């Protein structure tokens, strides 16, 4: 299949080269398979979710999206024009507060939710978990991502916005999980994106158009927006069957656009999420 005019990040998944706007990818399109967006949750009533949108869990007094971080997020995922698996099924779990903000024992607690709740769901292709949000280095933080890893879920997770070494942030800086920086559509390095050895993957993350709140789309940048990349590149290769959510980000990894991006310090990959399809 074929989407003309797509936003960069699209149409740079799908290619060998920068500066394309159309998006190459396998029809199935990520069907059967199940990601959650753990964040500000999701506007799911959105035209662009088709109905494939839904909020599994909140921790506050509404599930609904206040902010747009979520939305925007969800709709790299999964939205019929802006998303990378657009036949997915996305599930959102509300950590973050209507400012984007939200404490540790909260987040910790939604992604033992994933874990446990993938079982009252059904993703016979497998089940991915986007993780656009973190802070300082804990160990709590680090060992619910593993857990959630490590019960058959991708984790996919922000490298940070800090130009720094992202071993000092969490839950990025979990070894077992799937942790991806941002890169521009020039094939730069993103000048927020955290870099270091704990780094998996790039994927786009400067000037991502995506959905937002209120029925709308905007533009927005960070890792936050790498990551929803990542996490449905995995649904649509979990569904395509070459991979499974325990060697997901391995075999991204494999089989990456390598070498392409400048500004990748040294120690640090450079490898950018590609799905490979020939049409
Ligand atoms: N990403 C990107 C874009 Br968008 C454009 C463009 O203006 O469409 C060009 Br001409 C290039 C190039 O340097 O050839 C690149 Br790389
Ligand atoms: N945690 C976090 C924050 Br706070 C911010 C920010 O300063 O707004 C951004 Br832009 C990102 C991102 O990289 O998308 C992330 Br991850
Ligand atoms: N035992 C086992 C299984 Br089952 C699978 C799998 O789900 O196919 C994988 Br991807 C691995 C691995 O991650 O290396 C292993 Br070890
Ligand atoms: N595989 C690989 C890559 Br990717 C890069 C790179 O990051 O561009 C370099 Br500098 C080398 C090298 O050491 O020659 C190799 Br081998």
């Known amino acids: 299949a074929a989407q003309t005019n797509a936003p960069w990040g699209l149409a740079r998944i799908s290619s060998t080269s920068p500066g394309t706007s159309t998006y190459y990818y396998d029809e199935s ?163 927020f994106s955290n870099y270091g050895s704990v780094l998996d993957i790039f994927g786009p993350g400067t000037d991502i158009l995506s959905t937002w709140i209120g029925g709308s789309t905007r533009s927005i940048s960070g890792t936050s927006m790498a990551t929803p990349h990542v996490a449905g590149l995995a649904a649509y290769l979990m569904t395509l069957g070459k991979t499974t959510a325990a060697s997901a980000c391995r075999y991204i990894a494999d089989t990456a656009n390598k070498g392409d991006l400048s500004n990748i310090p040294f120690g640090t990959v450079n490898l950018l999420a590609y799905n490979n399809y020939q049409a």
């Open 29 to 191: 399109a990520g069907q059967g398979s199940c990601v959650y967006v753990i964040d500000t949750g999701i506007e799911a009533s959105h035209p662009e979710f088709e109905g494939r949108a839904q909020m599994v869990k909140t921790y506050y007094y509404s599930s609904r999206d206040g902010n747009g971080h979520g939305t925007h997020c969800a709709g790299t995922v999964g939205s019929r024009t802006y998303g990378v698996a657009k036949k997915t099924q996305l599930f959102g779990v509300k950590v973050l507060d209507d400012n984007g903000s939200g404490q540790y024992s909260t987040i910790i607690a939604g992604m033992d939710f994933v874990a446990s709740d993938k079982n009252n769901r059904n993703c016979p292709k497998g089940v991915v978990a986007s993780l656009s949000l973190g802070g300082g280095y804990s160990s709590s933080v680090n060992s619910a991502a593993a857990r959630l890893q490590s019960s058959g879920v991708m984790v996919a997770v922000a490298a940070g916005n800090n130009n720094a070494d992202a071993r000092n942030y969490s839950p990025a800086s979990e070894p077992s999980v799937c942790t991806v920086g941002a890169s521009d559509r020039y094939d730069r390095r993103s000048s």
